[PDB]
Amino acid sequence: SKKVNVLVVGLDNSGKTTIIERLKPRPRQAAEVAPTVGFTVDEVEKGPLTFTVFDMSGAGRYRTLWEQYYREADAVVFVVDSADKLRMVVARDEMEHMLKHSNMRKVPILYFANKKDLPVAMPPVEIAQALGLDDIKDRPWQIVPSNGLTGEGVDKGIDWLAERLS
Amino acid sequence: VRSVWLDAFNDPVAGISAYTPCVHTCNLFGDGENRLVIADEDRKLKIWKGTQKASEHPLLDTPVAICSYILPALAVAAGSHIYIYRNLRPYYKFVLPPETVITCMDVVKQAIVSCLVVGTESGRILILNPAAIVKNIWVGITPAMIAVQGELDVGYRITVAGRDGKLYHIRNGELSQTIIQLEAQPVGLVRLAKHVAVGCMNDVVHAYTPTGHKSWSLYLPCHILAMQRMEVTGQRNTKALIVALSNGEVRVYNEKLLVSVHVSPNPVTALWFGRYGREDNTLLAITKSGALDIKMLPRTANLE
Ligand SMILES: Nc1nc2c(ncn2[C@@H]2O[C@H](COP(=O)(O)OP(=O)(O)OP(=O)(O)O)[C@@H](O)[C@H]2O)c(=O)[nH]1
Ligand SMILES: [Hg+2]
Ligand SMILES: [Hg+2]
Ligand SMILES: [Hg+2]
Ligand SMILES: [Hg+2]
Ligand SMILES: [Hg+2]
Ligand SMILES: [Hg+2]
Ligand SMILES: [Hg+2]
Ligand SMILES: [Hg+2]
Ligand SMILES: [Hg+2]
Numbered sequence: 374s375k376k377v378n379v380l381v382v383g384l385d386n387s388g389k390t391t392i393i394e395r396l397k398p399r400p401r402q403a404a405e406v407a408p409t410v411g412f413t414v415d416e417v418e419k420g421p422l423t424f425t426v427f428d429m430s431g432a433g434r435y436r437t438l439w440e441q442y443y444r445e446a447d448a449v450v451f452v453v454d455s456a457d458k459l460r461m462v463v464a465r466d467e468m469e470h471m472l473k474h475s476n477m478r479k480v481p482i483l484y485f486a487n488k489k490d491l492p493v494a495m496p497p498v499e500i501a502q503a504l505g506l507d508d509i510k511d512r513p514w515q516i517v518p519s520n521g522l523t524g525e526g527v528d529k530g531i532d533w534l535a536e537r538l539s
Numbered sequence: 540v541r542s543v544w545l546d547a548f549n550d551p552v553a554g555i556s557a558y559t560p561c562v563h564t565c566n567l568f569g570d571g572e573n574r575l576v577i578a579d580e581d582r583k584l585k586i587w588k589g590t591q592k593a594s595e596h597p598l599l600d601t602p603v604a605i606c607s608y609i610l611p612a613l614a615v616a617a618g619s620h621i622y623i624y625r626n627l628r629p630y631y632k633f634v635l636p637p638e639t640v641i642t643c644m645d646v647v648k649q650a651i652v653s654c655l656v657v658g659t660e661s662g663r664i665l666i667l668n669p670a671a672i673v674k675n676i677w678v679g680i681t682p683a684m685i686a687v688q689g690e691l692d693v694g695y696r697i698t699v700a701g702r703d704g705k706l707y708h709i710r711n712g713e714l715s716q717t718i719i720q721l722e723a724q725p726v727g728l729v730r731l732a733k734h735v736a737v738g739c740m741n742d743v744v745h746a747y748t749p750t751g752h753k754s755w756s757l758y759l760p761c762h763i764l765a766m767q768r769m770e771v772t773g774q775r776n777t778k779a780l781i782v783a784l785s786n787g788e789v790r791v792y793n794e795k796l797l798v799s800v801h802v803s804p805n806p807v808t809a810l811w812f813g814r815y816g817r818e819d820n821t822l823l824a825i826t827k828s829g830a831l832d833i834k835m836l837p838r839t840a841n842l843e
């Protein structure tokens with residue numbers, strides 16, 4: 374295989390951890406998921422690729438930790454809780470600081486528009502609007518609506534990401 | 540010079556008619572995500588979650604102030620009554636024994652669970668049980684606004700801006716003899732780090748230590764409509780002051796230093812800074828046009 378570093382970031386409660394569950398074999402996956410504490414390095418297989426998955430907390434307190442992992446990242450997964458219209462700008466700000474950082478190379482970013490199932494969930498296109506994703510023109514990016522409970526979209530997303538890494 | 544804020548969300552067509560004492564954030568549903576609580580002039584109590592209005596509930600009288608103490612207990616004052624509610628539903632209808640009208644109300648930390656504090660037009664300040672009138676303190680004048688600093692166990696201060704343009708202090712139950720005579724009338728009263736900020740009708744904010752020393756003075760171009768503390772915890776650790784002016788602008792002073800300016804299309808009648816949704820540093824403002832505007836402060840934003 375080939376080993377790659379995948380940073381998973383996003384505001385707290387976007388479903389980074391839950392989405393990361395659906396990447397494990399179905400017997401491995403757990404039922405409820407605890408709010409990530411600090412951060413958790415994990416590992417995941419997908420074809421010719423081995424993903425070392427750094428799952429961060431998105432709580433206020435912990436966002437200052439993401440930068441510890443930019444230097445090594447070979448790709449980034451960015452989770453957005455589609456039903457949290459409120460914090461989109463905060464989501465955006467953190468995203469922007471990430472892109473700014475001198476350590477974060479122009480590696481591919483995959484945005485999951487997560488919780489696609491929720492009643493007030495925002496359309497992928499409105500999300501890409503708030504985040505100003507269309508402005509990103511030096512990296513491959515893609516936005517994929519997703520349900521992290523069911524697993525919907527997740528593979529479609531990871532599959533996309535895998536193309537870029539090959 | 541610029542605005543430090545992030546623009547979160549704006550609802551021009553919210554129907555909100557409230558001033559600062561009737562606006563609040565709490566964790567009612569215990570689920571971490573905080574909710575906006577408004578006692579509208581509708582005599583209706585409106586509840587907001589995220590960008591949308593969650594619930595609406597009828598109130599008997601038109602409200603003067605709402606507080607929330609200790610899990611949570613929304614307390615609505617009106618006339619001489621104070622209706623404690625629990626789990627959105629009504630729970631009690633306390634009435635102060637007159638000789639009465641409630642003017643202002645706020646809370647005090649029990650130790651390090653809080654306890655309701657009430658101003659009455661009579662000229663009395665009452666501190667109550669965690670549910671009955673426990674303390675009755677006499678001050679000469681009709682209270683215009685009050686602020687509480689400290690804990691009632693270790694030690695506490697109650698600052699009173701009177702309609703007589705005077706500044707009153709109460710340290711641990713006793714009314715001090717130290718009375719400050721200010722020029723114009725009271726307009727807002729915000730407790731800061733080392734002192735309290737009074738704003739007068741003549742467009743000026745003064746900062747006063749309990750001793751009566753005047754730390755600084757802020758001179759403002761238009762009229763003060765609302766004042767509010769902005770407490771940023773963490774590394775930045777400042778207790779700023781927000782003033783909103785009738786010319787539409789909203790300002791953040793870090794002590795004497797103006798740190799941000801932005802202007803709302805409409806004059807702000809109510810300002811709240813605290814937790815709302817899953818974000819710690821959120822500025823919620825209600826305009827005279829009834830609109831709701833939410834801004835929230837970047838992680839990296841310094842206030843010097
Ligand atoms: N309705 C719905 N709920 C979801 C979805 N994905 C996750 N959740 C739930 O929403 C919450 C999100 O949990 P997490 O996955 O831990 O959030 P997080 O991205 O890890 O953020 P942290 O707090 O930093 O761990 C939990 O209740 C999840 O089980 C989704 O796609 N739809
Ligand atoms: Hg609360
Ligand atoms: Hg509360
Ligand atoms: Hg009111
Ligand atoms: Hg009010
Ligand atoms: Hg209060
Ligand atoms: Hg008052
Ligand atoms: Hg107390
Ligand atoms: Hg008490
Ligand atoms: Hg008491």
Ligand SMILES: [Hg+2]
Pocket residue numbers: 653654655666667668669670673
């Ligand atoms: Hg009490």
Ligand SMILES: [Hg+2]
Pocket residue numbers: 700701704705706721723724725726737739
């Ligand atoms: Hg005054």
Ligand SMILES: [Hg+2]
Pocket residue numbers: 704721722723724725726737738739740
């Ligand atoms: Hg004054």
Ligand SMILES: [Hg+2]
Pocket residue numbers: 470839
């Ligand atoms: Hg910055």
Ligand SMILES: [Mg+2]
Pocket residue numbers: 388389390408409428429430431
């Ligand atoms: Mg997580």
